[PDB]
Amino acid sequence: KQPNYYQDVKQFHQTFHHPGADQPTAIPLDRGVKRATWTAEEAVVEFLHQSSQNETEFLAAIETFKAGLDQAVKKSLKETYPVTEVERLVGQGDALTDALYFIMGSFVEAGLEPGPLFEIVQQANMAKLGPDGQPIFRESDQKVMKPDGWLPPEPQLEAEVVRQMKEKA
Amino acid sequence: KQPNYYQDVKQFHQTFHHPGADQPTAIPLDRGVKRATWTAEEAVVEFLHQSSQNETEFLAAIETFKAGLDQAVKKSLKETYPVTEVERLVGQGDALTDALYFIMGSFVEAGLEPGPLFEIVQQANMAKLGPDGQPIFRESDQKVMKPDGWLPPEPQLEAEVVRQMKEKA
């Protein structure tokens, strides 16, 4: 039933040449900034836009978010910084686990089971291999590109939501 | 081996009287803002602070994050808003699934298996029941309070990181 989330993303990383550590290793700060940004693009911006009915709502929600973000930074500025690489790894792991917990709570509040949705995203991601079985990388920024004939996940994700609505009716 | 993440948080929500939907239901915007904020407090602020060695690093990372956040909002402002409740649910589910995927990728980049860490957080959360088997709620803000004798997760989470480092050595 439940997907092996970590092994599935680990697999995506190997297949498409994203970073992966075989031994626990603190994530370098410049790389962490990227990951934090990508995560929030989805968990904050897309989530809030898709929760909004107009520009006025959406902007008020973003500003409220920004104020909470700023309060959290101000609180963190008063806390001492890690002094070893192990300390940085431990604090990252702690933060990533709570973040995972909150994401999961948002699924609970939405009444959506995440496993089948994650499975759709995983399969579509893996289907980005070209017809030679190799990833397609664009010369600008090495972005992984979609091959000709690739079926996008969005409509299936939507059909999965409707399926769950029907199951729980 | 792998925890049932969704069922474990669903359980935490029932036990401690947080919201939960039995049928798939779009999350109201004011509630989504809260969840987005809590998620980013961990995935962005705590994660970046624990990735930093000093105030100068940390502030540069936060500003870089904010610039990416602002670019994403500007892009989203040009996209049409959902016009039904089902549309809002579908877009939230989509966003929450990608966010989950990125969190998982951060575990991959750190080389940390999330399951055992999540298990420690889950168990500590569940152990917040008082000695009558009931949650303790503070009159200010109904915050769930820790009972006398509660063992905090942080040191165990750290010991778990060291255990994984040892296993992968």
Author numbering:
A (entry chain A), B (entry chain A): 2 to 170
The paper states:
YP_001813558.1 and its homologs (dimeric dUTPases, MazG proteins and HisE-encoded phosphoribosyl ATP pyrophosphohydrolases) form a superfamily of all-α-helical NTP pyrophosphatases. The α-helical NTP pyrophos­phatases share a highly conserved four-helix bundle, one face of which forms the active site, while the other participates in oligomer assembly. Nucleoside triphosphate pyrophosphatases (or pyrophospho­hydrolases; NTPases) perform the important function of hydrolyzing the α–β phosphodiester bond of nucleoside triphosphates (NTPs) and are often involved in removing noncanonical nucleotide triphos­phates to prevent their incorporation into DNA or RNA. dUTP pyrophosphatase (dUTPase; EC 3.6.1.23) catalyzes the hydrolysis of dUTP to dUMP and pyrophosphate. Here, we report the crystal structure of NTPase YP_001813558.1 from the extremophile Exiguobacterium sibiricum 255-15 (PF09934, DUF2166), which was originally isolated from the Siberian permafrost.
The crystal structure of a putative NTPase, YP_001813558.1 from Exiguo­bacterium sibiricum 255-15 (PF09934, DUF2166) was determined to 1.78 Å resolution. However, in YP_001813558.1, an unexpected intertwined swapping of two of the helices that compose the conserved helix bundle results in a ‘linked dimer’ that has not previously been observed for this family. The structure reveals an interesting variant of the all-α-helical NTP pyrophosphatase fold family that contains an unusual intertwined swapping of helical segments, resulting in an obligatory dimer that cannot dissociate without unfolding of the monomers. This novel ‘linked dimer’ defines a new subfamily of the α-helical NTP pyrophosphatase fold and is distinct from other previously observed domain-swapped dimers. Size-exclusion chromatography combined with static light scattering confirmed that the dimer is the major oligomeric state in solution. A surface area of 5104 Å2 per monomer is buried upon dimer formation. Divalent cations, preferably magnesium, are essential for NTPase activity. Interestingly, although the YP_001813558.1 active site assembles quite differently from those of the other NTPases, the putative metal-binding sites in all three proteins are absolutely conserved, except for a one-residue offset of Asp95 in YP_001813558.1. Furthermore, the active-site residues that are involved in sugar binding of the NTPs are also conserved when compared with other α-helical NTPases, but those that recognize the nucleotide bases are not conserved, suggesting a different substrate specificity. The corresponding residues in YP_001813558.1 are Val10, His14 and His19; His14 N∊2 is hydrogen bonded to the O2 atom of a 1,2-ethanediol molecule in the ligand-binding site. The corresponding pyrophosphate-recognition loop in YP_001813558.1 is located between H5 and H6.
